[PDB]
């Protein structure tokens with residue numbers, strides 16, 4: 001099985017996929033985020049954030065209120081399973097999480113905290 005994925009966020013404010021699969025055998029899963037654009041992070045920086053679909057809007061609301069100083073996430077928000085740092089063009093970051101953290105029967109999503117329009121699903125198979 002494969003227990004990691006490579007994902008890109010670019011200068012046009014989009015990720016290069018809207019769907020990640022996590023094999024049910026994985027105990028840990030790694031997301032390798034890169035930014036193959038030319039814009040730096042103070043213009044078009046991206047991160048990658050994981051929550052349930054049901055929690056996404058609340059995470060974004062509280063992140064918005066927390067602001068740029070906190071990379072648009074409430075610090076220590078228990079609804080956020082994992083997240084990367086904010087990266088600009090040519091930079092990269094990876095995050096690894098325990099697959100045991102996914103609540104059984106719940107659909108998960110990923111998104112960019114800076115650009116909540118950038119989103120997708122993360123699913124067990």
Ligand SMILES: [Cu+2]
Pocket residue numbers: 009013044045046047112113114115118
């Ligand atoms: Cu973004």
